[PDB]
RNA sequence: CGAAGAACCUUACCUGGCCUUGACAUGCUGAGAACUUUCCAGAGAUGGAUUGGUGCCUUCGGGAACUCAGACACAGGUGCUGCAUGGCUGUCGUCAGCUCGUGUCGUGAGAUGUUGGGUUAAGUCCCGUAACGAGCGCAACCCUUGUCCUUAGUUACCAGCACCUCGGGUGGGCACUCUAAGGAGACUGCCGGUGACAAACCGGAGGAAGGUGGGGAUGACGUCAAGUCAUCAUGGCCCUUACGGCCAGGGCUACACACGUGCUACAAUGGUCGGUACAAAGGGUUGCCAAGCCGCGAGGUGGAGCUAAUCCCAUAAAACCGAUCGUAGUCCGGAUCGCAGUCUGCAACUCGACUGCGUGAAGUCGGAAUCGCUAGUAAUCGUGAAUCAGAAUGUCACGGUG
């Protein structure tokens, strides 16, 4: 039901989050490094929200481009943390590591960034609907032509599994020509786990 | 049930030069064994040529006409009464019924040299004493008994 | 000289980068030669629970490309090898 | 099974406990959990307490048992 | 002289070389009788020649790759059709009516894997 | 379990530890020209070592999840973690196709 | 069916032996570098010797990395809750429907749009109409298959010239085939009739392809409090001298019985013997593992070539040609059992897969009932792969005849 909106469109619409070739003797060795690099990076950068972490492999060393909407927090006083993380990523990934940081101007048009803010809000015991009605509107004032956000979980109930379904604009899903962002960030409340889905729809083609 | 079904045509019998025999060979074939079925069909043909001086194609044509029926019952229920309607057989359908009955009663002949079973069935079909002709006449006699429901309650 | 890569937008665009820079230095280099491309299909199952009728089969390419010199008298291409290789181009030298 | 290129088989602890115990002849049963080892002409007439799975059952070794392994003489399931 | 045609039917690619001659007929450097052994293939390859009654006028040299007996025979028929068209481009109507120039696009339907055949399902016992 | 992930890591460590003496012992055995006397003492070396050194004892599990069943050696993931890691484009060259 | 592999290992279960800050994370105290010890006891866990090494940056004080011992917080739990949940999937169903902004009617739950005529795979479209528009869904956009053009010729090809041992085998050529990137091509586009002449319907030309050319992916709002707390994550409860751990065996493959799926057959459209023809797709420098060679055979030696149009896996089988079998529980059928071996594995008894000899069963087309399939379809015959030390009738993938 509702197959993942990124996997269906890799190519004509979207592209992979890591471009690198390895033989059969190193494919599983590089995948394990690359998958646990993201887990370490996201756990370290809980603040300074991270949306995309692209990993490219040029000739034999590395290449990484961390995306942050607040690059100043990561780059503190001329890369005090950039070099500190460059030193430590080599230990988990033996090849030497390059780090690059870009901006996410208009940060209210990324599914991961919106989901992280929603998860933060719902862990402050904020109303489950007032947060979303304003989160959709703030993202719709500038940029996207359509947004859907689904909030499924306890929602404060005793035995309840209701799902919020607020939508605005046009969000096709069977159109492969479209360009659709997607993210799934969970929230751990004092009781229940609430999952958040986002379908920020940018321009087609 | 929108009418979709088109017509797929198969007409190829080079080593004898016919059209009905290819369709008949398609009925003898099992599991796509066209090469095996072709020599059995020709195997039962050369035996007919050996038996009778006339060309076996005329014997096969006479056999088809002696097994192909004219009318047959059609069990359509009125919704409370099990009736049967004798319906005129379509001109295209009557050849297929004969070609299917012939092989079906040939398989149960119980002789040796399987081509001989079909050769004997074809020889009997030209006279009228064959099991296929008896089955044809049984259905014909049933049709007369069913003639009361030709158009009324049909 | 034979090259190996995985996309036609690097290997077939780097052929000009070698041909122009080698013919500039006097030595005559004929046009490049394509070779047949490898095509490996990887077929795997996609359904988490057993509904096997769902399918997904991939493909990985490996474009090959061969050059041919006429008069070996220039080491500029040997020096300009790091420039020629950009991201995924592997070059095995056969200086004819 | 167990091709003749690598012909015989006997666990090292069982071998050292039986070859030495042949010198001081049979006055006790041999308690051993191993069932994978064959019996040998050097071990004819001994008493082996093969592990059934919850207790050790005695085994009377005869000259006609050399080909078969110990575990064939110990049950696994009852079905009474 | 000589005309070229290419045939394709049931994953069987064939090269057909029409030449003037007396119908020697060579397929993979051996005779037609040595290639197709007592089957409909002998005439089905020969059918387009007799349709336009030019069997004796042309020598035919053939090279085949891929597929089986009937598929390769259909490939040679398609190749001979396309080569004969290229030589005498006026009998397109005659071969169109016979349906020889129409390439048979029926390829083996991919197995819906899990269904035992491309369409055969398990027996579906309802209880 | 986590203790189960732990105990199969030392299996791989022990398998990779010796990695040569067992190969030499098995090469001695496989030679038809080798003497039965040189084979019988070689049997002792294999058996007196701990049994958790052969590749047979090793059970290649999912690297991130540890599920024993549903593993592919062209990746390092389970049957159900591979789909989650692939739909997000982490795996290079892996798409949805027909 | 989770199981894309139960001899141990997987493994949770059972019978024993052995552990208590613990196999693992952080913080505290002390001692040694790490390492290598090739030995003994013991089922192993574990315990005790154990030649030997004394590192590394040094503010020369020591610090860091690892291993051993103590104690606290603790770690751990495949223990319960899927009716507390996240995530993922099945489902009606790839069925064509499901909703919303404004206006109107109705006191109101509502309804209008989304109803009427025609048409359509389709809420796909046309004409009317208190409705005017939009969203989800349908179609198209994506992948694959079928025609043509341009670019370029090695490991691919051999039209012209030589050569030849007559094999493109060799020089050589860049014509072509062949290969694979970039693009055109199909939109009822055009003609006749039908329709309100408006969607659309029926025929025709051309074209490789004709009426969404074929197939695949893509399943709306929701339902079953459907399944999963055992893949993972998590609220709450419980164990924490054991419901947590390590090691041996055994067990999950037991067995009067009934059920689902699958392969063999019961034969003469066939069984054997000896000739002979054509595939696609894929896997291989921790691997494929050739030739010669020894074996009745599974196989043993051997080491080439090989990182792939190069070398191997690799002989496709059904069909076709000649002989015999003469429908006989049999030159059918292979289950069962006895003996003898090869390969993998520390280890083939419970409990593996194959090879050699002998034995030869039930089975003569199968009740009520009941299922899959509309075209390269059903039917039947092969090939190679995923999981994998070994292990397929299931399952992964593509092809012959049809
Ligand atoms: Mg109907
Ligand atoms: Mg409706
Ligand atoms: Mg295997």
Q: How far apart are CA E125 and CA B146, in angstroms?
A: 39
Give the ligand with the smallest distance to the CA of B3. Answer: 1
Cβ neighbours for F26, distance < 8 A, ≥ 6 positions apart: F46
Q: How far apart are CA F60 and CA F90, in angstroms?
A: 22
DSSP at D50: E
Tell me which residue has tokens 């603040």: A47
How is chain F classified by DSSP, letter by letter? -HHHHHHHHHHHHHHHHH-SHHHHHHHHHH-TTS-HHHHHHHHHHHHHS-STTSTTT-----TTT--SSSB-TTSSSBTTHHHHHHHTT-STT-----
Closest chain F residue to D13, measured at CA: F48
Spatial contact of A177 and A204, defined as CB atoms under 8 Å apart: yes
State how far residue C25 is from chain A, nearest Cα, in angstroms.
28
Torsion, CA E108, CA E110, CA E113, CA E115, rounded to 10: -60
CA angle F79, F80, F86 (to 5 degrees): 95
- CA distances, F18 to each of B138, D10, F55 (Å): 87, 24, 12
Q: Cα B21 vs. chain centroid, distance in angstroms?
A: 12
Spatial contact of C58 and F93, defined as CB atoms under 8 Å apart: yes
Q: How far apart are CA A188 and CA F58, in angstroms?
A: 37
Q: Inform me whether the C-beta atom of residue B8 falls under 8 Å from chain E C-beta atoms.
A: no
Q: How many alpha carbons lie under 13 Å from residue F66 in its C-beta half-sphere? A: 9
3-class SS shares of chain B: helix, strand, coil, % to 5:
55, 5, 45
Strand G: which of residues 13-52 in chain C lie with Cβ below 7 A?
30-45, 47-52
User: Tokens for A135?
Assistant: 């989160």
Spatial contact of A188 and A100, defined as CB atoms under 8 Å apart: no
Residue E104 DSSP SS3: coil
Q: How far apart are CA C61 and CA C64, in angstroms?
A: 10
Spatial contact of B59 and B126, defined as CB atoms under 8 Å apart: yes
Select from C43, F96, C11 the least CA-distant residue to A13. Answer: F96
Tell me which residue has tokens 């989160």: A135
Burial class (CB in 10 A: 0-12, 13-18, 19+), B102: buried
Alpha helices by DSSP H, listed for B2-130, are 20-28, 34-51, 56-67, 93-107, 114-125
Closest chain C residue to E112, measured at CA: C53
Residue B42 DSSP SS3: helix
Q: Cα B48 vs. chain centroid, distance in angstroms?
A: 18
User: Tokens for E79?
Assistant: 């190749």
| Cβ contacts of B52-61, under 8 Å, gap ≥ 24 | B52/B123, B56/B122, B57/B16, B57/B18, B57/B21, B59/B122, B59/B123, B59/B126, B60/B20, B60/B21, B60/B24, B60/B122, B61/B20
Q: How far apart are CA F30 and CA B137, in angstroms?
A: 79
Chains C and E touch (3+ CB pairs under 8 A): yes
Strand G: which of residues 34-73 in chain B lie with Cβ below 7 A?
34-37, 39-40
Q: How far apart are CA A108 and CA A98, in angstroms?
A: 28
Q: Give the method used.
A: cryo-EM
Strand G: which of residues 17-76 in chain D lie with Cβ below 7 A?
17, 31-36, 51, 53-55, 67-69, 71-72, 74, 76
Residues of A within 8 A of C6 (CB-CB) are 21
Residues of C within 8 A of E114 (CB-CB) are 51-53
Alpha helices by DSSP H, listed for A45-188, are 71-74, 80-92, 111-123, 130-141
Residue C64 DSSP SS3: strand
Q: Inform me whether the C-beta atom of residue D5 falls under 8 Å from chain F C-beta atoms.
A: yes
Spatial contact of F1 and F8, defined as CB atoms under 8 Å apart: no
Q: How far apart are CA C14 and CA F21, in angstroms?
A: 50
Question: First CA to last CA across chain C, in angstroms?
Answer: 8
User: Tokens for A169?
Assistant: 């604009």
Give the ligand with the smallest distance to the CA of B2. Answer: 1
Q: Cα D43 vs. chain centroid, distance in angstroms?
A: 8
Closest chain D residue to F38, measured at CA: D6
**What are the two backbone dihedrals, phi and then psi, of residue F34, each rounded to the nearest 5 degrees?**
-65, 150
Spatial contact of A46 and A112, defined as CB atoms under 8 Å apart: no
Q: How far apart are CA A78 and CA A80, in angstroms?
A: 6
Give bridge partners of residue E19 from the DSSP assignment.
E59
F73 CA to centre of ligand 2 in angstroms: 51
Q: How far apart are CA A137 and CA A130, in angstroms?
A: 11
- Which positions in chain E have a beta carbon within 8 angstroms of at least one beta carbon in chain C? 112-115
Select from D70, D73, D76 the least CA-distant residue to D9. Answer: D70
**What are the two backbone dihedrals, phi and then psi, of residue B99, each rounded to the nearest 5 degrees?**
-65, -30
Task: Answer left, alpha or beta for residue A191, where phi above 0 means left and psi between -120 and 50 means alpha.
Answer: beta
Inter-chain touch C87–A59, beta carbons under 8 Å: yes
């Amino acid at each position: 039901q509702k197959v993942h909106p990124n996997g269906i469109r890799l190519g004509i619409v979207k592209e992979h989050t890591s471009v690198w070739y390895a033989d059969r003797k190193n494919y599983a060795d590089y995948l394990f490094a690359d998958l646990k690099v993201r887990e370490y990076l996201q756990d370290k950068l809980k603040s300074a929200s991270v949306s995309r972490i692209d990993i490219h492999r040029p000739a034999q060393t590395a290449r990484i481009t961390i995306h942050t909407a607040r690059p100043g927090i990561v780059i503190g006083k001329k890369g005090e943390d950039v070099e500190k993380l460059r030193q430590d990523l080599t230990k988990q990934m033996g090849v030497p590591v390059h780090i690059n940081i870009e901006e996410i101007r208009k940060p209210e048009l990324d599914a991961m960034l919106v989901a992280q803010s929603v998860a933060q809000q719902l862990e402050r015991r904020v109303m489950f609907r007032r947060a979303m009605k304003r989160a959709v509107q703030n993202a719709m004032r500038i940029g996207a032509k359509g947004i859907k956000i689904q909030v499924s979980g306890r929602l404060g109930g005793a035995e309840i599994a209701r799902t919020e379904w607020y939508r605005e604009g046009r969000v096709p899903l069977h159109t492969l020509r479209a360009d659709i962002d997607y993210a799934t960030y969970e929230a751990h409340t004092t009781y229940g786990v609430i999952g958040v889905k986002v379908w920020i729809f940018k321009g087609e083609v | 049930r929108r009418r979709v079904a088109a017509k797929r045509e198969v007409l190829a019998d080079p080593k004898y030069g016919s059209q009905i025999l290819a369709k008949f060979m398609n009925h003898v074939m099992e599991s796509g064994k066209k090469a095996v079925a072709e020599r059995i069909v020709y195997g039962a043909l050369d035996k007919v040529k050996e038996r009778g001086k006339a060309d076996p194609l005329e014997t096969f044509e006479k056999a088809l006409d002696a097994i192909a029926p004219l009318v047959e019952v059609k069990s359509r229920r009125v919704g409370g009464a099990t009736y049967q309607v004798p319906v005129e057989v379509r001109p295209s359908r009557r050849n297929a019924l004969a070609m299917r009955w012939l092989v079906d009663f040939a398989r149960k002949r119980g002789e040796k040299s399987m081509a001989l079973r079909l050769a004997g069935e074809l020889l009997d079909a030209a006279e009228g004493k064959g099991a296929a002709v008896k089955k044809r006449e049984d259905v014909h006699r049933m049709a007369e008994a069913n003639k009361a429901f030709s158009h009324y309650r049909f | 000289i034979r090259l190996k890569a995985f996309d036609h937008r690097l290997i077939d665009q780097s052929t000009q980068e070698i041909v122009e820079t080698a013919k500039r230095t006097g030595a005559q280099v004929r046009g490049p030669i394509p070779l047949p491309t490898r095509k490996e299909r990887f077929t795997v199952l996609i359904s988490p629970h057993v509904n096997k009728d769902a399918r997904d089969q991939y493909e990985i390419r490996t474009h090959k490309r061969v050059l041919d010199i006429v008069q070996p008298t220039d080491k500029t291409v040997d020096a300009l090898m790091k420039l020629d290789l950009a991201a995924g181009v592997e070059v095995q030298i056969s200086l004819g | 099974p167990r091709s003749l290129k690598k012909g015989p088989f006997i666990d090292l602890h069982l071998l050292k406990k039986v070859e030495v115990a042949v010198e001081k002849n049979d006055r006790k049963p041999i308690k051993t959990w191993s069932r994978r080892s064959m019996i040998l002409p050097h071990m004819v007439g001994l008493t082996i307490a093969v592990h059934n799975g919850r207790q050790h059952v005695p085994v009377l070794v005869n000259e006609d048992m050399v080909g078969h392994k110990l575990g064939e003489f110990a049950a696994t399931r009852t079905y009474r | 002289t000589q005309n070229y045609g290419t045939g394709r039917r049931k994953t069987a690619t064939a090269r057909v070389f029409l030449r003037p001659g007396t119908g020697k007929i060579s397929i993979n450097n051996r005779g037609l009788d040595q290639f197709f052994g007592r089957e409909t293939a002998r005439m089905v390859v020969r059918q387009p020649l007799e349709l336009t009654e030019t069997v004796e006028k042309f020598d035919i040299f053939v090279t085949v790759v891929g597929g089986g007996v009937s598929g390769q025979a259909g490939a040679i028929r398609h190749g001979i059709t396309r080569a004969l068209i290229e030589y005498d481009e006026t009998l397109r109507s005659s071969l169109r009516k016979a349906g020889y120039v129409t390439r048979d696009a029926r390829e083996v339907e991919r197995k819906k894997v899990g269904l035992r055949k491309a369409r055969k399902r398990p027996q579906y016992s309802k209880r | 379990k986590e203790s189960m992930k732990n105990r199969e890591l030392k299996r791989q460590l022990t398998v990779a530890k010796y990695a040569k003496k067992r190969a030499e012992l098995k090469a001695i055995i496989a030679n038809p020209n080798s003497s039965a006397e040189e084979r019988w003492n070689a049997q002792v070396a294999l058996q007196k070592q701990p049994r958790d050194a052969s590749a047979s004892r090793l059970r290649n599990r999912c690297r991130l999840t540890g599920r024993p069943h549903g593993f592919y050696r062209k990746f390092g993931l389970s049957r159900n973690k591979l789909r989650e890691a692939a739909m997000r484009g982490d795996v290079p060259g892996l798409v949805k196709a027909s």
